[PDB]
Design a protein around this ligand. Structure first.
Ligand SMILES: [Zn+2]
Ligand SMILES: [Zn+2]
Ligand SMILES: [Zn+2]
Lengths: 56, 101, 176, 214, 85, 140, 113, 95
RNA sequence: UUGAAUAUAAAGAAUUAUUAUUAUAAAUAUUAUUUUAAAAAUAUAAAAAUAUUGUUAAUAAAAUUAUCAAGUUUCAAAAG
């Protein structure tokens, strides 16, 4: 029920959906490198108690 | 919740008040009470008379978006348009009733 | 804080003070016993308590009668906000004989705007039951159709609706 | 209600039988323990219209009536809808609280008399009217030879001259013997069913028809 | 424990129908129609409170005096039955 | 009530839900406005201010009756301030006028009192459950 | 999906001996929540106790109006004020029940005709 | 307009008190017209003056069951149909 | 509306927060935002025999209760 496993499973149905076009097998296909890449990080204002703010 | 996954749905809408289907204007005809008025009894008084009230922002309807036309607060919620005849007739004091000269 | 002179009628509840006194409600029923019991408490309201000083001078007596209320037409004509140099009565009239008419001060009109919004409220409740006296009134009338159609169906299908046993456990009129 | 369980044997009250309830015999050895005598949660009796419409038509006939010999009258009506002495008393509590009947100890005696209260007295007079209005329809004599009982019209009118109080005396036992023959060949069997109103008060809806056995 | 336009009844209320408690709609037998009842007083509880006897709240000194009139002096009618069938 | 003393309620000063099983306390049929005299709706409504002055009997089978709009002082014609009225010869008079005083206009609401409807404001007082010596309860 | 609470499917035992749920199917929930549940086609020839299926549509009758179709439209504004992800705007929430879905059922009460 | 008088609310409550005085002596009773106790000091009876744009929560009530309302006086618009209807009251007596 | 003109839903605490903004008016809408399989502390206390201040700087002005929630008394010091 994790989120990380549902995000990658969104790829492993799209990637192999594109892999089968490249000729790549649908069956014998492996995951060689599955790496996370630090990406965009918004800055949200948070309002802590007693007049202190700390940016989420 | 017969959902198996709760959400903005499968939250059983009225797990009580099983006596549904009230024909107000039909029933209002038996009481002889101005069908337009009776139906107003059964929605928050903000929605019909000229009263101070709190509206949700989606309820307000958005400007013409690239995805959707200008959806005015009325054409999506017809039975919430305030009826200012029914307001004035009931709630405000007419010049007539105090005309002295 | 929204000076009381702004409200159409001075406010009903009047908050005060008193760090060492915590109670919202003004103690009425004490402001009432005084005033009803003691005549002097409330200023005479000039007219009804003038008209002496004008009978005594012109008649040589105490009036010794109930003074008319509703000050005579023509009295307090220069005054503008009488409301105190009177009871809360209206400014009496011109010095005329035309039928009495309320000089529609901003105050009188507001009272009209209450006695219409009192009739408004008592009317939105009076008929929220009048239709609640149909919904539940007709829901029962319909529910008894249900127990009738259930009453008819539960005889041909023979479901006694009284447990797994036969009526021989009922006829004992025990628990069993 | 069975013969020997709550009640002594032979007390098979000859009134409206309940439907489907098999009357079975219990050996004359039976007795509860000193505590089971008391648990014994009975079955609740109908006290609705049809008994309260039927009881009052009795107490409208016998306007002042000693309570003791009251039950010996409801047995006599062809339309007895009352299962046993217990059902009568519970209806008699109902009709008491309704304001219909009003018990008064018959001062000259030590027995109470179900007096139809003057408050709702003019209601039962109309109420006994409709049933009689709707009862004389059924009889096969009312309509076949109406003149057989046209002999009764004059008599009873001139009967009320000399012996009206003594006429019906014999008429009272006469029907008491002729309603029993009926009550051997047909009874009003009461089939009931529970039901729960919107306020969660489980109660029974009833109805009554006449079972033909011969 | 509930009355009427002119009459009375009695009923123990659950948790589920706490809404209908103050003023119910019911068949008023001193009439033939449903009529609004009120809540003239309490007559106990619908279940046990923890660690308490069967009559935890107790009906009342009041609803007892209503009972002692209904069942009470039935001496007008131990005739036609007492408790038997 | 009977409630000898030191047994009545203390903080709110009165018990909620006066039980009245002894006498049913219903609105009568021969009922009429004290001030106006027009017949009053039987019980389907709270348009009437039913003041049962404890056990009254004299004003009606039960206590005085007034439609909410007939609840004004008859003599001065304004509201009955603080709701204490003075039944002058079968027409409720304002206590101050009925007392001889003359200040004859209030501030807040002139021609309609602040009263509650259908005894709901009068059930702070009068006839709680043990009216009289009901010792039937403990006796055999 | 809203938390790792497990979901068991508690169902009463044998329904083939029932009278109300004789041959119903529960592989999927009713389409609009006021619509009666899909039936096993092998036993499509089943009718119900009337007091059960005449009081149901008494209840299901309130969602077939437009005042609920306004409370439906409206609720989708609440869930957005309370922001709940993936809630369509109340401008494209065309009703659950409709006139095209009226014609079948009044003509599905051919029993009382 | 030809002769239809612009009747202020005060009037349509002065024409009610006149009409209620007519109906009374049309019922045969004594027509206690309100404004014949009205003198130079106001109500001669020493009563609180009844001011005419009368509140709807203080409607003049006579315990004799006389009905006068807006439906009544609206046709009495022009000058002529009052000088004949309420002739007997608006006209003073010179005998 | 039969008035010329004029204008009618939404705050403040930094927020969609503690939060009935009480100017008014009454009085049964079956008005509708609160995750979840445990024991420690802790916030907290239903329940329950004895004991009654030995605890402590010092018990007793210290939530609610249908078992209906209230200690009495004396002395000394102490004005409004
Ligand atoms: Zn009743
Ligand atoms: Zn009145
Ligand atoms: Zn007065």
């Amino acid at each position: 029920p994790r989120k990380g496993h549902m995000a990658v499973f969104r790829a492993l149905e799209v990637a192999q959906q594109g892999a089968e076009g490249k000729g790549l097998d649908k069956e014998h296909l492996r995951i060689a490198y599955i790496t996370c890449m630090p990406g965009p990080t918004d800055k949200q204002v948070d309002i802590r108690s007693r007049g202190y703010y700390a940016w989420k | 919740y017969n959902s198996f996954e709760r959400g903005w749905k499968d939250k059983t809408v009225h797990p009580l008040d099983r006596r549904g289907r009230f024909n107000l204007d039909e029933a209002a005809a038996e009481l002889q009470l101005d069908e337009a008025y009776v139906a107003s009894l059964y929605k928050p008084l903000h929605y019909t008379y000229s009263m101070k009230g709190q509206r949700y922002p989606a309820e307000q309807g958005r400007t013409s978006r690239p995805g959707s036309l200008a959806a005015s607060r009325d054409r999506m919620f017809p039975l919430y348009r305030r009826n200012y005849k029914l307001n004035r007739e009931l709630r405000v004091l007419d010049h007539r009733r105090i005309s002295t000269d | 804080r929204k000076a009381l002179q702004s409200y159409p009628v001075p406010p009903r509840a009047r908050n005060y003070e008193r760090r060492w006194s915590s109670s919202r409600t003004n103690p009425y029923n004490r402001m009432f016993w005084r005033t009803v019991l003691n005549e002097d408490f409330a200023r005479p309201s000039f007219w009804v308590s003038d008209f002496r000083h004008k009978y005594l001078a012109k008649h040589g007596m105490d009036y010794q009668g109930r003074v008319p209320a509703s000050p005579a037409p023509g009295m307090y004509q220069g005054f503008s906000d009488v409301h105190k140099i009177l009871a809360n009565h209206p400014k009496p009239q011109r010095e005329s004989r035309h039928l009495p008419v309320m000089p529609m001060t901003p105050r009188v009109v507001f009272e009209h705007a209450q006695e219409k919004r009192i009739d408004y409220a008592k009317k939105m409740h009076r008929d929220r039951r009048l239709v609640e006296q149909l919904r539940t009134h007709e829901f029962w009338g319909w529910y008894m159709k249900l127990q009738r159609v259930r009453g008819r169906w539960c005889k041909e299908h023979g479901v006694s609706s009284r447990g797994v046993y036969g009526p021989a456990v009922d006829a004992a009129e025990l628990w069993g | 209600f069975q013969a020997g369980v709550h009640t002594p044997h032979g007390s098979r009250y000859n009134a409206a039988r309940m439907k489907n309830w098999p009357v079975q015999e219990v050996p004359q050895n039976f007795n509860f323990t000193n505590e089971q005598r008391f648990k014994a949660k009975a079955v609740p009796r109908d006290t609705g219209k049809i008994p309260r419409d039927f009881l009052l038509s009795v107490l409208y006939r016998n306007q002042p009536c000693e309570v003791a010999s009251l039950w010996e009258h409801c047995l006599h009506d062809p339309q007895i809808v009352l299962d046993s002495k217990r059902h009568l008393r519970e209806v008699l509590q109902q009709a008491r609280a309704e304001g219909f009947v009003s018990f008064e100890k018959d001062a000259v005696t030590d027995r109470w008399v179900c007096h139809l209260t003057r408050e709702r007295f003019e209601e039962v007079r109309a109420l006994v009217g409709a049933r009689a209005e709707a009862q004389d329809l059924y009889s096969g004599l009312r309509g076949a030879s109406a003149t057989e009982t046209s002999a009764y019209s004059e008599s009873f009118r001139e009967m009320n001259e000399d012996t009206k109080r003594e006429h019906f005396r014999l008429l009272s036992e006469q029907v008491a013997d002729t309603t029993t023959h009926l009550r051997k060949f047909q009874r009003m069997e009461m089939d009931y069913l529970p039901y729960t109103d919107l306020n969660g008060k489980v109660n029974f809806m009833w109805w009554y028809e006449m079972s033909d056995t011969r | 424990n509930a009355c009427h336009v002119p009459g009375d009844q009695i009923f123990l209320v659950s948790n589920s129908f706490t809404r209908r408690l103050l003023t119910r709609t019911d068949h008023c037998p001193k009439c033939d129609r449903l009529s609004t009842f009120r809540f003239m007083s309490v007559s106990g509880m619908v279940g046990r409170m923890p660690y308490k006897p069967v009559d935890t709240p107790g009906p009342s000194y009041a609803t007892l005096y209503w009972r002692k009139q209904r069942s009470g002096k039935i001496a007008s009618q131990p005739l036609n039955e007492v408790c038997n069938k | 009530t009977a409630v000898p003393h030191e047994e009545a309620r203390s903080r709110p000063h009165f018990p909620a839900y006066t039980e009245d099983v002894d006498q049913p306390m219903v609105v009568p049929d021969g009922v009429c406005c004290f001030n106006c005299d027009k017949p009053i709706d039987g019980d389907d409504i709270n348009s009437y201010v039913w003041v049962p002055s404890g056990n009254a009997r004299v004003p009606t089978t039960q206590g005085y009756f007034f439609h909410v709009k007939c609840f004004k002082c008859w003599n001065c014609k304004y509201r009955i301030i603080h709701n204490q009225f003075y039944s002058k010869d079968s027409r409720a008079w304002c206590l101050s006028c009925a007392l001889g005083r003359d200040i004859r206009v209030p501030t807040r609401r002139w021609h309609t009192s602040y009263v509650n409807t259908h005894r709901t404001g009068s059930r702070l007082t009068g006839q709680f459950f043990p009216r009289h010596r009901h010792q039937m309860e403990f006796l055999f | 999906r809203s938390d790792n609470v497990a979901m068991y499917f508690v169902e009463y035992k044998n329904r083939d001996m029932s009278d109300n749920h004789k041959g119903e199917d529960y592989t999927a929930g009713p389409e609009r929540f006021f619509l009666p549940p899909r039936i096993i086609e092998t036993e499509k020839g089943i009718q119900r106790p009337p007091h059960m299926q005449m009081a149901f549509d008494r209840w299901a009758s309130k969602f077939k109006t437009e005042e609920f179709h306004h409370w439906w439209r409206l609720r989708h504004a609440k869930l957005r004020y309370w922001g709940v992800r993936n809630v369509p705007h109340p401008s494209d929430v065309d009703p659950l029940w409709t006139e095209k879905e009226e014609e079948e059922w009044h003509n599905e009460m051919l029993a009382n005709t | 307009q030809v002769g239809t008088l612009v009747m202020s609310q005060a009037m349509r409550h002065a024409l009610m008190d006149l009409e209620r005085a007519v109906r009374r002596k049309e019922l045969g009773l004594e027509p206690n017209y309100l404004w014949d106790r009205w003198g130079p000091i106001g109500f001669i009876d020493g009563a609180r003056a009844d001011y005419l744009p009368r509140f709807e929560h203080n409607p003049y009530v006579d315990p004799d069951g006389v009905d006068v309302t807006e439906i009544d006086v609206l046709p009495f618009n022009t000058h002529e149909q009052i000088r004949e209807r309420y002739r007997d009251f608006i006209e003073p007596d010179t005998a």
